[PDB]
Design a protein around this nucleic acid. Structure first.
Ligand SMILES: [Mg+2]
Ligand SMILES: [Mg+2]
Length: 132
RNA sequence: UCGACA
DNA sequence: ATGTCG
């Protein structure tokens, strides 16, 4: 019951909070479709959110109806709400991620999409295909 | 008091 | 260890 015709996203970090990156891959083949340049300070959940929204934009611009898989219960909710409820402090070190998060929410408030955003069931299926 | 997803 | 939700 894995929908193989899908995009899978995941975050990678060093520290949490710490250096965050994310990527999107074809669930079937593992082909890397997008990979964000490391952001110097962010949280896991912020990254997971940015990964989903990147995915939405990526599929929309390509006229693709594929669903997105994420393993992140938090990020799935934040995208549904159009609001990333992060605790991360705001300062000059966290300005970049917070700018990206604000711009992701703005995108969600200005665009439509029909893309199903699905939970990857790790306990049944193993690590998501985009894992680091 | 946890439980869960990372 | 921390970041987050039910
Ligand atoms: Mg993940
Ligand atoms: Mg992972």
């Amino acid at each position: 019951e894995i929908i193989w015709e899908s995009l899978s996203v995941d975050v990678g970090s060093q520290g949490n909070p710490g250096i965050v990156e994310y990527k999107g891959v074809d669930t079937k083949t593992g082909e890397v479709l997008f990979e964000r340049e490391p952001i110097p300070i962010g949280t896991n959940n912020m990254g997971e959110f940015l990964a989903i929204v990147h995915g939405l934009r990526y599929l929309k611009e390509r006229n693709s109806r594929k669903p997105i898989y994420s393993n992140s219960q938090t990020a799935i909710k934040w995208v549904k709400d159009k609001k990333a409820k992060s605790t991360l402090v705001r300062n000059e070190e966290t300005a970049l991620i917070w700018k990206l998060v604000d711009e992701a929410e703005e995108w969600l408030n200005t665009h439509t999409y029909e893309t199903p955003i699905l939970k990857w069931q790790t306990d049944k299926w193993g690590e998501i295909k985009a894992d680091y």
